[PDB]
Amino acid sequence: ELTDITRAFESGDFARPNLFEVEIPYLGRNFSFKCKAAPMPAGIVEKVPVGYMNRKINVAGDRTYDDWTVTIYNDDKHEVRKAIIAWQAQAHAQGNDISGMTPADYKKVATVRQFSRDGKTITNEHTITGLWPTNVGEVQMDWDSNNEVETFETTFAIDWWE
Amino acid sequence: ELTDITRAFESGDFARPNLFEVEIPYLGRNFSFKCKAAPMPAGIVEKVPVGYMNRKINVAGDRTYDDWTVTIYNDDKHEVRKAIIAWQAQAHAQGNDISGMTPADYKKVATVRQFSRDGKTITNEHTITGLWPTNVGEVQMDWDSNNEVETFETTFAIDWWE
Amino acid sequence: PLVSPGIELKETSVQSTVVLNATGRAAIVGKFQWGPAYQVTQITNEVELVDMFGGPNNQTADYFMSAMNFLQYGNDLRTVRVVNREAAKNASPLVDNIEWEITTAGSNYEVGDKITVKYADQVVDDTGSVTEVDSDGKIKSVFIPTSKIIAYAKSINQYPDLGSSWTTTITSQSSGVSAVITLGKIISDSTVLLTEPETAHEEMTKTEFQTALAKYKMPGIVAAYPGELGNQLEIEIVSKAAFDKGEQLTIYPAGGKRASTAKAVFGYGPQTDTQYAIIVRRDGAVVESAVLSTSRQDKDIYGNNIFMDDYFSKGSSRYIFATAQGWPEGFAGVIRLGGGVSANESVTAGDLIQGWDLFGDREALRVNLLIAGACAGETDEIASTVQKHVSSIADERQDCLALISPPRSTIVNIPLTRAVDNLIDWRQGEGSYDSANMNINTTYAAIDGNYKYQYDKYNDVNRWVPLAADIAGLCARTDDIAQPWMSPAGYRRGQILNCIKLAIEPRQAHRDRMYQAGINPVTGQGTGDGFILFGDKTATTVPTPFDRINVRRLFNMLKNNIGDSSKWQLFELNDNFTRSSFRMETSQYLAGIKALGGVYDFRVVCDTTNNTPAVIDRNEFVASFYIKPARSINYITLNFVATATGADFDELIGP
Amino acid sequence: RAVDNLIDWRQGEGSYDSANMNINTTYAAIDGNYKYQYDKYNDVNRWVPLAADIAGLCARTDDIAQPWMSPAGYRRGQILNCIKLAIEPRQAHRDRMYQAGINPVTGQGTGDGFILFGD
Amino acid sequence: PLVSPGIELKETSVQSTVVLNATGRAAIVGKFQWGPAYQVTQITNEVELVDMFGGPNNQ
Amino acid sequence: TDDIAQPWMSPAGYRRGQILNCIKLAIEPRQAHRDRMYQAGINPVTGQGTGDGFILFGDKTATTVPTPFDRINVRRLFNMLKNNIGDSSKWQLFELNDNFTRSSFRMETSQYLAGIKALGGVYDFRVVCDTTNNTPAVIDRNEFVASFYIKPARSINYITLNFVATATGADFDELIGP
Amino acid sequence: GGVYDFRVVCDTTNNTPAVIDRNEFVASFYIKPARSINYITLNFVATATGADFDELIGP
Amino acid sequence: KDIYGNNIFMDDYFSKGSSRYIFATAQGWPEGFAGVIRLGGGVSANESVTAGDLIQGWD
């Protein structure tokens, strides 16, 4: 009966936690090749307890969403990091200005995809609506930190995903 | 016997304290999307004590109503706050005039609704007769009050609700 | 309405009506005055009914009043109309023309030459014309303004068919040989029955009808449905040639000349040579306007199709149907339709039987209540033979509840002491009712036991109505107040709403006699203007657990839910997972009913103890539900004991 | 009459004795209804022979569940785009068709669904 | 049951019975109303008994 | 109008469309004349119902042939769209017509129209842009294609009020039935 | 789960030399395909108050 | 219809219960008629009343 595990992969394989890409139209093609890691989003619907006598039964509460945090490789001329900060600069101006554009301007659409083990084929695809970068991570530069490529985290807020 | 609590929701669910809207025809559609909170009205009928020997028995007194207080989000061009004050200005002129229109002019009708958990369906609807804004709240603006949207309370008088 | 934007203020009398909008679905068949025939339709409020099927009148009110009553409690009334195929006819352009026949062709006449009309050598009219000639100047077509001829034939008592003396002298400023035309009948009878737009083309285009249309040079337009309302309709067709020139239109067949309003009703004309603008109006008021094309393909501004045979057949119209198949070139005449007739008084058992069978499918339509009921307006043998058959639809489907009523003859204005006896005798099939009998024994039918007197707000009259619709109303609207195992009877529920009076009130000694015959008594409330349904029994005479209506409707509610959940196990394997799945889901369902209080207890039995391999090998799956339904109070006994002073309760009762 | 014509056509009797069916092979599946459908190019409703949708089910099953799974049912076998079918076979007729090897296609138990209801 | 596939809903009175299924083996001889005679047989639940040897009666 | 309510709102009416500074107009069109002008596509401008107000009292562009772009509000709506999407699309000139360019242009313009849908300019919209029209026979001539299907908002234009002068007695519980 | 069980038969028990000498090769597959549910029978039994399930059914 | 939209057909106006002096019908009405009528020969016969009447009344 051990062959029964094949029912767990009628589709042809297990999904693989590394065969993925992220597309963000605002940032051009090259961002999709520079994004190292990204959690495919959680879906949270917190329970409400309703008490009766001395027992409690649960009912569905109201949906909420956590932030979405990616990790990026940075190139030698910072073509991503300068773009992410220049995007955030529309939400609230970095530097000596005290300004920021309307929500319709700084919100953007983004898409996460996971490929089949044939690299041609997309098997799951979620759009994420209304990204903007709430926090662009520090780069912890250090003369003892030799033999790594530069990476940083970025934490987008989201409105919903589908 | 714990399943008995299902008798508490034959209608399909508990009512939810957030699935509501307020309509005030005088202020157009957009007010209904800007009204954050509103207590579905109280109904008060104060008791009268009638004494006999050394005991007292109660009888129904005469109905009264408290004020109705809502809370509003304000937009960047004050399309609500200027309208509420310009409504109150008919009850007694704001500024240097000493004038105010007849009660038939400044009184208005309003409606509170609560939806089912299917967002299409209205399950309870109360009209409120003869609103007018007795008090438009302060906005407590402050340079330390960062990371909130602007809200204010408004306290309408009412004649009755049905 | 206006052409410019603006406010229009008006005064009239008109029957705008509000709606109560509680949930509930039922089905009905009847002889309405207008709208589709032998086609199932959905009505959801008062005004949809009035617009789609027309207002009540003397011959049709029983069906309309029945429909309108249920539609005040529920919100879906799946409805079918029937008509007698040999008798009903659609209103048509040919009616009240005179059958002219060519008797001598003449020579050298021309278009606009005068037609005289004479009877007893008195001139009746001479304003008719030669309307087409060949190059020889022989007559090929004529037009006669028949309204003037009719004024004579209606006062001479001759209208349906004309005498010998009617003569046609064609007189003009040039002739080669004197032409002669003969007049036959005024065609008061009408040529076509057209029921269902999907089917329409062939019935509108047989050569016999098309020959008459071509002869009078008329467009192929008819009233969309068989009925009387069609005789009100007037159509103002126009084309580029007439529209741009702003010409005076000609009225057919009556005669007359009129200014067009087409350039006011639309924003623009029909745009090209092959397009005709239609306006249709009734009682003066416009009801529909269109721009249509006789080109085998053509497109309006959006890219939707506007070829003649499509626009109508796709189901857009509910006043007129038309076809391109014989359309006259360039035509711009006003048409008045005539000779439409419903023939409702001719309706026979074969019609209502054929109508009710459209609800026969157990799969296609989840309808809880078959109203029947309105059929109890008819003669005794129609009311019997139709209602027995309708109960058989409940016996074939085994999923619903059918109502039943005694016919009008049984109760209305018969003395009480006789009326109840007639009603039992009709129920069990004796006396003069032995041919028009009831003998139905099924648990899927509920016999109603009274007739009601009600105000018709459309005609403004009081009329008698078979009560079944209101009982269906109770059995439906209960579902939005308390769950389906709750009885429709009582005083906290079961109020009959709108009434003046019932045909009889059964006193206790009679009320017992009816109830043991399985007729449900409906009575006045204990005082005032209330009326209540006062009992439950399905029509069974043999004892059975499914005796009371509430038990029947409970097992319907279960069968119609578990009989859906089980569908998801068709074409599965009968393995251990399929069994556990079906046991857990249906137990979860029945636990809900147990908590709400429909059943005291239940068991679900489904495992190897009945799905033995001898079942598996024939592609079968089995499960058994053991269910004990709720009791109810029916009989309340109150004892008052008038004890003495002294003799105290601490001695007699001892608290 | 329609169901009787359809059996008589299936087994080659009545007016169908020249235009008959007599096929007995296990490589053929006889479809049992006709559908009414919207043509979005001409913008008309028209009647269409149902076979294409049944081929559709027998194909697209292969991307939902493996080829030994039946195309019939309610969790599968939804006919997609329809207004109505030419007949609905009531139970007494549905039995008579199915013993002639015609597959009945019917309305779903309610609403706008239609399903292939046999193999 | 039907000839066509489908759901058949029915009402009756019938004695479907559940089983406790703990292990144990024993032997018995008797005068049952139906089933094989002078032949050893294996019964393993209530319903196998009722189907193979028939229901009880007075004798 | 653009600083009071969004461009698909008509300039006509009484809550908007006040002409500000005037003494009088050269004519006032009575109803029988007002109809005759409006079917010629001339917009009537009139006195307000009383006092010193004057209002623009109708919408029609100068078309005589029927067309969807008849009313001024529909015209100004499609101008607002064409003049925004006809700017967003500029950023795809001299790109490749690859899968990313298509998804970029579909997502951005959908995000834009979703704003218009929420504010209520259009009841619904579809954006069609993929292999179903950007077939290789388009690619090989340096072309890119997209189709927007848009159903614009209706409006009230004609208001009909009925006053019915019923008798004493003859009560509303019988005639209307609340 | 397409087949409950199968056998593949292919050896000297059928590829006898009398097959070899005519340039032929043989194999036999014995396959028992899956059943299916086609007919569902649901029984609803409308038993009395009292008359309890611990007596009639015996859990 | 009268001015308000209420019905004024002969057989309705009387049968709905409006009148308490005269009843009429259209069923044989003379054309164009404009005569003054005086009604006659009405009689109550109260002195003839018998047990059967009051018994039928009280019921």
For residue E6, give the chain G residue with the closest CA.
G39
CA distance F160 to chain C (A): 5
Burial label for C440, CB within 10 Å (0-12, 13-18, 19+), is buried
Answer whether C595 sits within 8 Å of B10, measured CB to CB: no
**Coil/strand/helix, residue A4:** helix
Closest by CA position to C92, among listed C216, C191, C235, C1: C191
Q: Is the peptide bond prior to C253 cis by the omega test (within 30 degrees of 0)?
A: yes
Answer whether C268 sits within 8 Å of F157, measured CB to CB: no
Answer whether C13 sits within 8 Å of H4, measured CB to CB: yes
Report whether C421 contacts C506 (CB < 8 A). no
d(CA B155, CA B70): 6
What single DSSP character describes residue A138? P
Physical contact, E and A (3 or more Cβ pairs within 8 A): no
Helix axes of F99-119 and F72-88: crossing angle, nearest 10 degrees: 150
Q: Does B10 touch chain C (CB under 8 A)?
A: yes
Strands C25-30 and C369-370: parallel
For residue C591, give the chain B residue with the closest CA.
B3
**List of chain E residues whose C-beta atoms are within 8 Å of the C-beta of residue D72:** 5
Both tokens of B123, joined, read: 């399950």
Closest by CA position to C43, among listed C35, A90, B91, H59: C35
d(CA B133, CA B108): 10
Of E2, E17, E18, the CB nearest to G39: E2
Residue C654 gets the label, from left (phi > 0), alpha (psi -120 to 50) or beta, of: left
Q: Which run of H or of E encompasses B153?
A: strand B151-157
d(CA H16, CA F118): 56
Answer whether C198 sits within 8 Å of D36, measured CB to CB: yes
d(CA D93, CA D110): 20
For C9-25, the DSSP string reads: EEE-------------E
Strands A44-52 and A108-115: unpaired
For A65-107, the DSSP string reads: ---EEEEEE--TT-TTHHHHHHHHHHHS-SSS------HHHH-
Answer whether F165 sits within 8 Å of H6, measured CB to CB: no
Question: Subunits touching G (CB < 8 Å, at least 3 pairs)?
Answer: C, D, E
For chain F, the DSSP string reads: -TTTS-TTS-S-SSSS-B--S-S--S----HHHHHHHHHTTPPPEEE-SSTT-EEE-----S--S--TT-SHHHHHHHHHHHHHHHHHGGGGTTS--SHHHHHHHHHHHHHHHHHHHHHTSEEEEEEE-STTTS-HHHHTTT----EEEEEE-----EEEEEE--PPSSS-HHHHT--
Burial label for C246, CB within 10 Å (0-12, 13-18, 19+), is exposed
Closest by CA position to C85, among listed C357, C354, C313, C319: C354
**List of chain A residues whose C-beta atoms are within 8 Å of the C-beta of residue F107:** 25, 109, 111, 127
Answer whether C267 sits within 8 Å of F66, measured CB to CB: yes
**Coil/strand/helix, residue A46:** strand
Answer whether G57 sits within 8 Å of C600, measured CB to CB: no
- Quickly count: other Cβ atoms within 10 Å of residue C478's Cβ: 22
d(CA C439, CA H42): 49
**List of chain F residues whose C-beta atoms are within 8 Å of the C-beta of residue H5:** 164, 166
Q: Which residues of F touch H (CB under 8 A)?
A: 164-167, 170
Q: Which residues contact B138 (CB under 8 A, 6 or more apart)?
A: B152
Please name the amino acid found at residue H2: D
d(CA D115, CA E7): 15
Both tokens of E47, joined, read: 């319903």
End-to-end Cα, chain B, rounded Å: 38
- How crowded is the C-beta side of H56, counted as CA atoms within 13 Å? 8
**Coil/strand/helix, residue A58:** strand
For residue C590, give the chain B residue with the closest CA.
B3
C305-339 burial string, b = 16+ CB within 10 Å, else e? bbbbbbbbbbeebbbbbbbbebbeeebbbbbbbbb
CA distance A69 to chain B (A): 21
Of C313, C363, C568, the CB nearest to D107: C363
HEC string of chain D? Answer: CHHHHHHHHHHCCHHHCCCCCCCCCCCCCCECCEEEEEECCCCEEEEEECHHHHHHHHHHHHHCCCCCCCCCCCCCCECCCCCEECCCCCHHHHHHHHHCCCECEEECCCCCCEEECCC
CA distance F166 to chain H (A): 6
- The CA dihedral of C508, C509, C513, C518, to the nearest 10 degrees, is 10
A66-101 burial string, b = 16+ CB within 10 Å, else e? eebebebebeeeeebbebbeebbbbbeeeeeeeeee
Closest by CA position to C322, among listed C331, C339, C310: C310
Q: What are phi and psi of F171, to 5 degrees?
A: -80, 160
Residue A147 gets the label, from left (phi > 0), alpha (psi -120 to 50) or beta, of: left
Q: Does B4 touch chain C (CB under 8 A)?
A: yes
d(CA C60, CA C50): 13
**Coil/strand/helix, residue A35:** strand
d(CA D101, CA D119): 8
Answer whether A55 sits within 8 Å of B8, measured CB to CB: no
Strands E6-11 and G39-45: parallel
CA distance C70 to chain H (A): 24
Q: Does A104 touch chain F (CB under 8 A)?
A: yes
Report whether C80 contacts C29 (CB < 8 A). yes
- Quickly count: other Cβ atoms within 10 Å of residue C554's Cβ: 23
d(CA D6, CA C642): 80
Closest by CA position to C74, among listed C49, C40, C37: C49
Report whether A87 contacts B32 (CB < 8 A). no
Answer whether C609 sits within 8 Å of E7, measured CB to CB: no
For residue A60, give the chain B residue with the closest CA.
B13
Both tokens of F66, joined, read: 């029927």
CA distance H24 to chain F (A): 23
d(CA C233, CA C218): 16
**Coil/strand/helix, residue C97:** coil
Closest by CA position to A109, among listed A68, A66, A65, A137: A68
**List of chain A residues whose C-beta atoms are within 8 Å of the C-beta of residue B4:** 52
Of D43, D70, D72, the CB nearest to C304: D43
**List of chain D residues whose C-beta atoms are within 8 Å of the C-beta of residue G33:** 68
CA distance C573 to chain G (A): 5
Give C598-601 contacts, CB < 8 A, sequence gap 24+: C598/C483, C598/C484, C598/C485, C598/C554, C598/C629, C598/C630, C599/C485, C599/C554, C599/C627, C599/C628, C599/C629, C599/C630, C600/C628, C600/C629, C600/C630, C600/G49, C601/C628, C601/G52, C601/G53
Q: Which run of H or of E encompasses B113?
A: strand B108-115
d(CA C308, CA C285): 24
Both tokens of A124, joined, read: 């799951």
Report whether C94 contacts C210 (CB < 8 A). no
Distance of CA C360 to the CA centre of its chain: 18
Query: Which of D90, D98, D112, D117 should one mutate to test binding to chain C, selecting the residue with the greatest count of C CBs within 10 A?
Result: D90
Q: Which residues contact H58 (CB under 8 A, 6 or more apart)?
A: none
Q: Does B148 touch chain C (CB under 8 A)?
A: no
What single DSSP character describes residue C327? P
**List of chain A residues whose C-beta atoms are within 8 Å of the C-beta of residue B2:** 52-53, 55, 57
What single DSSP character describes residue A119? T
For B43-79, the DSSP string reads: -EEEEEEEEETTEEEEEEEEEE---EEEEEE--TT-T
Residue C101 gets the label, from left (phi > 0), alpha (psi -120 to 50) or beta, of: beta
Strands B68-73 and B35-37: antiparallel
Cα separation values, C109 from B2, C250, C330, C564, D2, Å: 100, 22, 23, 78, 57
Q: What are phi and psi of B81, to 5 degrees?
A: -60, -40
Question: Subunits touching H (CB < 8 Å, at least 3 pairs)?
Answer: C, F
Report whether C238 contacts C249 (CB < 8 A). yes
For residue F167, give the chain H residue with the closest CA.
H4
HEC string of C480-545? Answer: HCCCCCCCCCCCCCCECCCCCEECCCCCHHHHHHHHHCCCECEEECCCCCCEEECCCCCCCCCCCC
**Coil/strand/helix, residue C101:** strand
Please name the amino acid found at residue C528: G
Answer whether C314 sits within 8 Å of D44, measured CB to CB: yes
Closest by CA position to C5, among listed F151, F74, F160: F160
Q: Which residues contact C92 (CB under 8 A, 6 or more apart)?
A: C190, C191, C192, C222, C223, C337, C338, C339, C340
Q: What are phi and psi of B124, to 5 degrees?
A: -140, 140
CA distance E6 to chain D (A): 8
Cα separation values, B32 from B20, B70, B108, Å: 10, 12, 15
Both tokens of C291, joined, read: 């721009």
d(CA C117, CA C162): 13
Answer whether C264 sits within 8 Å of F39, measured CB to CB: yes
d(CA C616, CA C579): 12
Answer whether A104 sits within 8 Å of F104, measured CB to CB: no
Strands C620-629 and G39-45: parallel
**List of chain D residues whose C-beta atoms are within 8 Å of the C-beta of residue G2:** 66-68
